Write a protein that binds this ligand. Structure first.
Ligand SMILES: [Mg+2]
Ligand SMILES: [Mg+2]
Ligand SMILES: [Zn+2]
Lengths: 72, 126, 55, 189, 143
RNA sequence: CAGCCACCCGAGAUUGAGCAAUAACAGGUCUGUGAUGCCCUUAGAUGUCCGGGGCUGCACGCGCGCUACACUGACUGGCUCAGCGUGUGCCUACCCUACGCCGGCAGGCGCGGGUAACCCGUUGAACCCCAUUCGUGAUGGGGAUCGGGGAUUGCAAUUAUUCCCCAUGAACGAGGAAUUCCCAGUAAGUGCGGGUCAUAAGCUUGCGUUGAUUAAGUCCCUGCCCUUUGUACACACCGCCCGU
């Protein structure tokens, strides 16, 4: 029951983050956290890294809600 | 086991120290009280304690002096003195030990009987 | 002696140092604006003082 | 040119329910930039039907004590989840909200017995205004308890709740409660 | 990305287990003498990155963190930051940490009970020592 | 007809309080009074000072409440808005404070204004807003308990007045039967003032600030009014009254 999310990526979970998250219609730290079993801090850092690399498009940013979408 | 020590300094230097040096070893409060000054009838109790200690025979305990005052446990000048602290109706007998420095006399004469409960009655649970 | 003991307890701040200017009671005193009267005496003399009820 | 927030038009929103056309206010006199208008719609009966539906949702979001009166937070929570409904569905978020309102409102439900009674319940029909009110209340409640004790933020729970209600899916709390009420009304017919 | 250099999921410091997944300055708070403010000041004056988690720091970093934790005044931590200032008996300013230091200095209640002070008596009787009413509160664990 | 509903125009188409009849209660108050009648006491006093206790004492039961159980949140910075009002006193000691300096802090030391639309003050309130870190767990939620230090008011702070710091880090994951208060700038969040006040608000009395859901109805529950009706009641159903 108690979920055990990661705090840093392993190679398997760093994978499936570079070729499926860039394909989601909606990319959010909570969505990625739930679909990759990672913590919110790690999800935010990973999404910021992806956006820095140009693979993700930022739709809106807020202190309480940050929204990304696929680059297509 | 080891000789008594208060804030790093032991019995003899505590006797040899003045009030100004006491205020440094004492905590906040018991420093404010000393800085504000020991009023009269505190000096009266101190001098009665001194006289009782002096008149005491060798190796024997001093005679107990009784007081209403919840007063400072001053530097060991009061240590070894036999004091009866008024609790409200009785003068409880207390021997001043070195670990009692910096405390109040009233901390050693309880003013109430500890509660040993009886069976609930009347409208205890309405 | 009794001269130095009678009424020797300091009375400068507490409720023992204030009283009603009318009845000398010490409870329910109104110190606001300098009235220094208890609640009941104030209700009794409010119209004379000039305090009237509007709302 | 009175798009909500500054991005969502209303000219394309179709209520297409006839029954609730007069009670969902979205289209021409009810096209406003923001879901915040102060407003005095509670002063006289039925006026809240003149209130824009997005503002009604915004007001219904301020719930459970700790969020009472925090309307700026709720307009933010609607602006987001409109931005998210658009990403998830590709449709106008206003259309999704209107479809959710249509789908989540009960048509029948049970009251205490008829003229009088103290044993069972009797089925009756629902006013259009009560339909819209109950739809908003159920959608907001479903979002609220989806977001509670969960990393999923509000404005994500509400977006998915509205999307499911627009789809008519049974993954929606509002649709489940509507079906439950309608079935109980059926049993007490 | 997890660090290959044996990311310490569990770290032993002072006979206490800290979690390597926890961010530093909150992982070392598990030590029974350190809480939040002390941890932050210790890590600030130990010059370690505060964004790191407890598993990514090396052995040298953890060693110097432990030393600066056990010798606060030797690294210019103010005397008012400590939990054992002007300690009775030896009037030394210090920070008491973990088992053997915090719980043993906790066992200064026997001083109060030996002098039979009122606070020590209230401790011995299991009652409350800071002058709170006991009519209708604290009725848990008292049968 | 008396009026009711809707709409226009309109600042407003029901703002909120204050006062409030005849008659009654063995309702509360002799502990507000130099308001009081009768008793009691009145000098080793139930008068009055003065020490010390108490009024808090804790197996337990019951009211009003405060803080919570988090992410619609905590933390950390940044930004930006109030109103009601109170300020130096007969006795009477005790005011509100700008600015400078010293100190994490609580504080301390100098200097001024103000008896006040004149000074505090342009009252730079909180929530809220913006960004940050946390990441679903008793967790960085939550802050009970407890230790060690430091100050302030006071004639004395121990049974810890209050305040500061560092530590410690409990229950609590939304609450059973059962109940309260509420119809618009309202409920509820959120601070602020007045009273109390040497020291002091989890109380109360006011003030703004953000600001809703629902209702425009009915006697179903709870009362309370009537009206007709019955009475052997009239001290009035806590009545009256029958037999062993
Ligand atoms: Mg009725
Ligand atoms: Mg009769
Ligand atoms: Zn009076």
């Amino acid at each position: 029951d108690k979920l055990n999310n990661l705090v840093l990526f392993d190679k398997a979970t760093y994978d499936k983050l570079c070729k499926e998250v860039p394909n989601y219609k909606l990319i959010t730290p909570a969505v990625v956290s739930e679909r990759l079993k990672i913590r919110g801090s790690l999800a935010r850092a990973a999404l910021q890294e992806l956006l820095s690399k140009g693979l993700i498009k930022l739709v809106s940013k807020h202190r309480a809600q940050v929204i990304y979408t696929r680059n297509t | 086991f080891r000789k008594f020590t208060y804030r790093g300094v032991d019995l003899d230097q505590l006797l040899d120290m003045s009030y100004e040096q006491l205020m440094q070893l004492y905590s906040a409060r018991q420093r404010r009280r000393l800085n504000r000054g020991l009023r009269r009838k505190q000096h009266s109790l101190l001098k009665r304690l001194r006289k009782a200690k002096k008149e005491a025979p060798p190796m024997e305990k001093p005679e107990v002096v009784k007081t209403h005052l919840r007063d400072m446990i001053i530097l060991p000048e009061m240590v070894g003195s036999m004091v009866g602290v008024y609790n409200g109706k009785t003068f409880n007998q207390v021997e001043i030990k070195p670990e009692m420095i910096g405390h109040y006399l009233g901390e050693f004469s309880i003013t109430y009987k500890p509660v040993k409960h009886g069976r609930p009655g009347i409208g205890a649970t309405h | 002696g009794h001269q130095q003991l009678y009424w020797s307890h300091p009375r400068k701040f507490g409720q023992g140092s204030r009283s009603c200017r009318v009845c000398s009671n010490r409870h329910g005193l109104i110190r606001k604006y300098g009235l220094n009267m208890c609640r009941q005496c104030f209700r009794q003399y409010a119209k004379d003082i000039g305090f009237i009820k509007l709302d | 040119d009175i798009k909500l927030f500054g991005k969502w038009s209303t000219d394309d929103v179709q209520i297409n329910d006839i029954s609730l056309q007069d009670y969902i206010a979205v289209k021409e006199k009810y096209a406003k930039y923001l879901p915040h208008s102060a407003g005095r719609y509670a002063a006289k009966r039925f006026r809240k039907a003149q209130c824009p539906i997005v503002e009604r949702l915004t007001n219904s979001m301020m719930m459970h004590g700790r969020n009472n009166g925090k309307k700026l937070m709720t307009v933010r929570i609607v602006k987001h989840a409109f931005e998210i409904i658009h990403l998830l569905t590709g449709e106008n978020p206003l259309q999704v909200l209107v479809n959710a309102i249509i789908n989540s409102g009960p048509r029948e439900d049970s009251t205490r017995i008829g003229r009088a009674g103290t044993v069972r319940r009797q089925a009756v029909d629902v006013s259009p205004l009560r339909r819209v009110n109950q739809a908003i209340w159920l959608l907001c409640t479903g979002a609220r308890e989806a977001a509670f004790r969960n990393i999923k933020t509000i404005a994500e729970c509400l977006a998915d709740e509205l999307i499911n209600a627009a789809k008519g899916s049974s993954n929606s709390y509002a649709i489940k409660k509507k079906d439950e009420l309608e079935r109980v009304a059926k049993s007490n017919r | 990305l997890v660090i290959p250099e044996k990311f310490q999921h569990i770290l032993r410091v002072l006979n206490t287990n800290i979690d390597g997944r926890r961010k530093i300055a909150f992982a070392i708070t598990a030590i029974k003498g350190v809480g939040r403010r002390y941890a932050h000041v210790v890590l600030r004056k130990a010059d370690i990155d505060l964004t790191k988690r407890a598993g990514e720091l090396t052995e040298d970093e953890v060693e110097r963190v432990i030393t600066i934790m056990q010798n606060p005044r030797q690294y210019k931590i103010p005397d008012w930051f400590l939990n054992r200032q002007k300690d009775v008996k030896d009037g030394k300013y210090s920070q008491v940490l973990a088992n053997g230091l915090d719980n043993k200095l906790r066992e200064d209640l026997e001083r109060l009970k030996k002098i039979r002070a009122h606070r020590g008596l209230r401790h011995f009787w299991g009652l409350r020592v800071r002058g709170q009413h006991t009519k209708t509160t604290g009725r848990r664990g008292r049968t």
